[PDB]
Amino acid sequence: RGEYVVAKLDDLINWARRSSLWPMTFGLACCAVEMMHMAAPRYDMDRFGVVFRASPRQSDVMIVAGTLTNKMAPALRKVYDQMPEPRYVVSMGSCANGGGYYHYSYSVVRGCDRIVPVDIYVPGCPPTAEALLYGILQLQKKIKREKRLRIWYRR
Amino acid sequence: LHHAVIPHGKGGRSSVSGIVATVFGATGFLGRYVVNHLGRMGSQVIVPHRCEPYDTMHLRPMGDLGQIIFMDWNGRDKDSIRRAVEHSSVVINLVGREWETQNFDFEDVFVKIPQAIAQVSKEAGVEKFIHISHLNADIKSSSKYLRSKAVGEKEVRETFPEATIIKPAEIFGREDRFLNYFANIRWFGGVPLISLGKKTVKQPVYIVDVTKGIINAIKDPDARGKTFAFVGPSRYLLFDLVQYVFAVAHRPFLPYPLPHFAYRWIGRLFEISPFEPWTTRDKVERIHTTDKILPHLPGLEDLGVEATPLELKAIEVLRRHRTYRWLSSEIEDVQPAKTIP
Amino acid sequence: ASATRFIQWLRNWASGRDLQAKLQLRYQEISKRTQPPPKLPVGPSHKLSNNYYCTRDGRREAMPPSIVMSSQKKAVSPAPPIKRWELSQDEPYL
Amino acid sequence: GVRTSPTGEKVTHTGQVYDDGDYRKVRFVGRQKEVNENFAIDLIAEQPVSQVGSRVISCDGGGGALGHPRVYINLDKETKTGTCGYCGLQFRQQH
Amino acid sequence: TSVKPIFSRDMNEAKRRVRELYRAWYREVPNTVHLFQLDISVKQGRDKVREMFKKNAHITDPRVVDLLVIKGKMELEETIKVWKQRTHVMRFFHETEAPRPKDFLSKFYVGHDP
Amino acid sequence: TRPTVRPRNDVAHKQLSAFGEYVAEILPKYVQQVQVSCFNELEICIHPDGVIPVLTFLRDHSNAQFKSLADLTAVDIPTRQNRFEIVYNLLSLRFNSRIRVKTYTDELTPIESSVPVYKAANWYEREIWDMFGVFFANHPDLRRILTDYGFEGHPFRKDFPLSGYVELRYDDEVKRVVAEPVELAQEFRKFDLNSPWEAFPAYRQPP
Amino acid sequence: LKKTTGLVGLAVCETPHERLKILYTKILDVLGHIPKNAAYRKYTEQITNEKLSMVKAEPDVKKLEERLQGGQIEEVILQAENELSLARKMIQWKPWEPLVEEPPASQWKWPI
Amino acid sequence: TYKYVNLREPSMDMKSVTDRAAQTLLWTELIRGLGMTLSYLFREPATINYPFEKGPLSPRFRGEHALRRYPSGEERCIACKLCEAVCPAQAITIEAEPRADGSRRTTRYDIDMTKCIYCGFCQEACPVDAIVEGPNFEFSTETHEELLYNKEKLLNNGDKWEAEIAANIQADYLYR
Ligand SMILES: CCCCCCCCCCCCCCCCCC(=O)OC[C@H](COP(=O)([O-])OCC[N+](C)(C)C)OC(=O)CCCCCCCCCCCCCCCCC
């Protein structure tokens, strides 16, 4: 049966991608400090297979951890475009989510989703390190639900 | 007008354009520009999609919060069509495929599916209906793609008499399968052209021109019940167009004539791919079909769109096809192709 | 706390410290997560008499700046020269 | 309580409901309309009126400093009950 | 009416600074198009430069002209050193903004803005 | 010593007043006003022509030695014909003292760059130019520092709107970030907070 | 002799007494060209002469440093060089002259 | 008082000089640093097993918002708009009118959770303990629109979390 095979192959690639999520070493403001605390020993994001890598060419996730200003917006879009696919964006904190405390500023982008597509929105100012980890595990369960091969089979 | 659809604002992202549009086939080449233009002015857009939600992510930034709504649908299921259209004021059909698959053939995507969308839209009270046909649609065509475009075009008009039907020539743009198609031939050495491209004339049209024409059709009360032909401003011999493509890309051009029957055999070879075929017999036919001249139909000028010359936009498409040595060459470094007068 | 004796010895030797006296993981020396209710004190203005607000109103004692010179004898410095610091007697040199 | 319009859309405790022909109800298609089922106007009406022996009664909402500011309610009218303006509890003076 | 100058003592001196700035912008456009890999032509870039100078043709205050030139030099420096990105260069061309017709009727149909 | 009231330090007020007129005596060509607040901060208000002479004197004079420029900022007061007040906050480590020097300028009048006196002033003046549009003459490298490239206007002016005039988004058609006129899904809600009853009689202005 | 002043880049001076005498004497000479009634001259001569008195009457560096209250003797030398530089600059500025211009009517009024 | 962090003179007796030569050639102080990381290898790690284990919190924790009720079930909020006035982010939007029974109640109460800075000023300002920040911090969403809370969402949060919220308020209200 073709369906059974592509169903199992979807599980394999979905498992491999969520089990090995490499965020780009990309932080913007206060929220990056809680992101640092997710890598710290108490939460040890490495133990889920989550490893920071500096190069966008070697990153699977962009965690927008902090305010995105207008001056920074073209750079964030640049490094997002330079990530190979599949790629995911996690929006962390009120600033990234929708402008937050600086929503009405002349120099702030009112939400990073004006610039890049966003898979998960982590609320808080900042979200606790555990709240960000909950957001990453939520991203994993989203990847687990993907049906690329199943949809390809029925094209 | 219901009070929720009275236009407000200054026509920006956070405005209210009053358009509530269901766009079928929004996840393709043409759809991304149509959804972008609707979202620019604060329209409500319903994007029914068959694909993986990952492949709709590029659409999400195009609208203010709540202005892009995604739905699952199946071209064979009429309920899924009804749910996606019963709140809309205009329905736009951009469903199409350049190859047949095991599950959907040209008849399914260019006749059965477009007819079902039109039928359900009429039953649901949808007021406007825009359907994309093809300039060269002809029942007497060697291309099954173009034969189905002719059958479905008649069906849509009969099912939804007030529909606006748009017939574009080949569309060129960043994500096209036209200029990118010719540029990608370089991977096989020389460029095979039937009769050396001297017996074909094309009149390609810019993607943004088609998009602006679609958007003005929605807002134009005179466009209801009409059939338009969206053509670019100049006609070229196929050989000249392909030579120009390779000049803009600064790639070596080796054209050699290939007979029609040999090209078809090559087309059948690439069709064996279970993915997106690089080329097909039908694709070879359409590329070598002369673009019809239809003076009796209204065109882009009748919707307030001035057609963009191919010379102003080819580099926007073809710069990525150059090597490092030639990446920075400017728009004025290549002379235009001979345009048929 | 659950390390075996030999492992405690090994890491004590490797670091050169007695690591068991100051473990960085918290056990039972920390406070209970449920506490008795507090009974917080009140401030000096919680009185029933001799407490008129006009006698304890800091904002209404703020005054506009004193104009020293406007355009409408020994030299001085802004303050006395700063006294020289003394070396620590706890540990003068690190 | 929570009623449904003729379209089937639940009516909220604020009386909100999209009318037929309002496109905005498309946002609920494939999802749901979040409606709180415990209507406070119905719940408070269920409380019994409290009988008291004085012309004026005070209400703090209960729980001491966990309620609302303490207010005093006049009970001189027998044509109606005194209602706390913070919590809606009703009081009556008996004979 | 006696004020401290910025650079130019009079409009005659100011207009000299303007011309030198115009030359610098005119010379730079071919470099900007090539370096930034813009899809506009050198003629479009130079027409835009002319459009920006034309909008301030009515100034008769030497201090205002001096400040316009100072900002023009700053803008040119940002472009030459590629501190600006392609997005910043293309902002002068407002490519994504739809025309707003200026006739009374067209405004009347769309809203209350004069 | 009332527990909730800030105590008065009269010794500092006397010391700063004495030094206040000391500076006025030595630099009468420039000093226009000298004042000491009720929390013992000395302010010297000078004609803008004296920025370099006054700052040089305060840095170098043996009875001043204000070697550190703690801060250099501007304030916009639109009701004044010279709307911009330039404020230098200086620190003296030798005498453990602070002093504020204030001058003024308008939109079209340059102020002398004080980088030759304090190298710290380099970026502070760039910020003042960026946020207020005050031009500093003979600045080694005057350009925007905080605002976006090509940004138009000076945001810290009182008449520049809070949310500016343009905003950014990514446009898929041109495949780049674009700038467009600002529209807010929720307009900022202006609150009128001031009570209509006077609070501080000590500061009442004459009618 | 000091091995170090403790401040990075401030070299130890081998002959601080003579260096101070040179500098204060130079400062006094420069003040001679300032008008007699200029407050900068009167004040700077007064404080400059006090330091010159203390240098002459105190031969020990440490005891001299305590009297001067200016930090290290190398710090005091630097301050003398700074004062000399200021005195020369004051001659071109002439800040003893009357106020160049009154401010507008309400330039310093606060609150507006 | 002050101290010198780095102002010491090495001794020049032959033993000290050789001690330093052995340090330079035998890498003794680099070997010493290896000892420290070795000791950490055999220390129990500080990692907790999320999501089966949770980091410790206190009753004052400021998390997801919720609108509360009295024991009768009536809403505590009486539309005073103090929370809306104090909100540093202007995250709160309120409309109100007399209810059908005359009560002073809101018809709109929105919190934009992407504007909110989770500062807790709103619950300090509330005179009736109506708006609170609850203990939930695990409510990340897949879409932006899901974080624009209206009154129905906030009331559902209160009904969902009231058991924990009431106990947290009981533990801390004597510090307020
Ligand atoms: C140390 C070495 C380690 C090597 C590890 C090797 C990986 C082992 C696990 C393999 C899993 C199966 C592959 C699935 C991943 C495919 C990537 C993908 O997600 O595509 C989604 C795509 C989705 O396509 P789509 O049609 O649904 O939509 C994409 C188009 N748009 C953008 C318009 C939506 O799937 C496919 O296109 C085809 C899937 C076929 C799966 C079977 C793979 C056959 C392999 C032959 C390929 C031909 C080249 C020969 C390569 C060598 C053969 C081994």
Ligand SMILES: CCCCCCCCCCCCCCCCCC(=O)OC[C@H](COP(=O)(O)OCCN)OC(=O)CCCCCCCCCCCCCCCCC
């Ligand atoms: C009978 C007659 C016999 C005659 C023959 C006698 C010969 C023996 C006596 C000769 C001396 C023996 C020691 C020689 C070893 C090499 C010593 C050496 O090169 O160290 C010097 C080097 C520089 O140190 P530095 O202080 O920076 O600079 C010196 C001043 N310019 O310092 C360094 O190299 C620093 C290295 C930094 C990187 C270190 C990272 C790893 C450290 C841990 C490794 C532990 C060693 C484990 C070896 C495993 C071997 C399998």
Ligand SMILES: NC(=O)C1=CN([C@@H]2O[C@H](COP(=O)(O)OP(=O)(O)OC[C@H]3O[C@@H](n4cnc5c(N)ncnc54)[C@H](OP(=O)(O)O)[C@@H]3O)[C@@H](O)[C@H]2O)C=CC1
């Ligand atoms: N040169 C051109 O591009 C020209 C195009 N046209 C017509 O314009 C329309 C769109 O053009 P283009 O956008 O380039 O075509 P694309 O192939 O780029 O996009 C096709 C769209 O149709 C959808 N679709 C295809 N097959 C099915 C199916 N079986 N069931 C459901 N959805 C389906 C695709 O969804 P998914 O992504 O899920 O496959 C995709 O969104 C087509 O009708 C085309 O014929 C007319 C003239 C010229």
Ligand code: SF4
């Ligand atoms: S969301 Fe809050 S914590 Fe995060 S960057 Fe913005 S202000 Fe800082």
Ligand code: SF4
């Ligand atoms: S927590 Fe602070 S920012 Fe959030 S709604 Fe309450 S007052 Fe506003």
Ligand code: SF4
């Ligand atoms: S402060 Fe409390 S009672 Fe007042 S409007 Fe806000 S939630 Fe309602």
Ligand SMILES: [Zn+2]
């Ligand atoms: Zn009550």
